């Protein structure tokens, strides 16, 4: 029925690697001392442009096209902030103590104090980056985790449900195939699988706490939010 289940492990990895969105740049202004309104403007503008690439990255995820239009909308509405965060965390691996929102926008926890309530989200994001760096997370594992977020985070807020779970099982087979490829023993394979999937619980937590902060930003009306971001934000009520 669906061609995603017929792909092999390497073909699954290649399709996810080739689908990777590009690393966008922040607005050029050197700008570096920041205020609440200026930092929120740079991140909001960056997040709005990353969403356009994420939506096109989602259609390239094997099995995502097979869902109905409403099912695709629901999965992206619930996962979009998680996907932004895990990408930011992955970009910040090689920069301990820093968050790489863009190649020209590297911030630390001191700059998170400019925005009211963001320093808490910053520390959790930095902690996830240290966790990935301590685990030596590979890019093949990262694209698997990110697609798991897209398919799993909304599967329980809905025949069609068995499709997503079978695609989720495919990625699980792909993750194990990557770990057996790197020489990990059987005990190390299911242990590392568990460690990686448990971090998704914390990424969900960071997203929920992030949604609250972005909701108060709409009520503060300090920075005008784009209509696309407003629709993704109103989906969480």
């Amino acid at each position: 029925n669906s061609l995603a289940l017929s792909l092999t492990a390497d073909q699954m990895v290649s399709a996810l690697l080739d689908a990777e969105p590009p690393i966008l740049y922040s607005e050029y202004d050197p700008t570096r001392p920041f205020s609440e309104a200026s930092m929120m403007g740079l991140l909001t503008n960056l997040a709005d442009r990353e969403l356009v690439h994420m939506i096109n990255w989602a259609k390239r995820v094997p099995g995502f096209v097979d869902l109905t239009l409403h099912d695709q909308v629901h999965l992206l509405e619930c996962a979009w902030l998680e996907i932004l965060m895990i990408g930011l965390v992955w970009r910040s691996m090689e920069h301990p103590g820093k968050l790489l929102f863009a190649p020209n926008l590297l911030l630390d926890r001191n700059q998170g104090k400019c925005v009211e309530g963001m320093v808490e989200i910053f520390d959790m994001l930095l902690a996830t980056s240290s966790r990935f760096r301590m685990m030596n997370l590979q890019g093949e594992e990262f694209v698997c985790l990110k697609s798991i977020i897209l398919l799993n985070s909304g599967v329980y807020t809905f025949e069609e449900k068995d499709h997503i779970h079978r695609v989720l099982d495919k990625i699980t087979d792909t993750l194990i195939h990557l770990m057996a490829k790197a020489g990990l023993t059987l005990q190390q394979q299911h242990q590392r699988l568990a460690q990686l999937l448990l971090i998704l619980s914390h990424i969900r937590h960071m997203s929920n706490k992030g949604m609250e902060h972005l909701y108060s930003m709409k009520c503060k009306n300090v920075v005008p939010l784009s209509d696309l971001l407003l629709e993704m934000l109103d989906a969480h009520r």
Binding site: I55, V73, E77, D227
Partner: peptide
């Protein structure tokens, strides 16, 4: 009418 609807159908 959702913007997300339009972006998922475009390319």
């Amino acid at each position: 009418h959702k913007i997300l609807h339009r972006l998922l159908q475009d390319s």
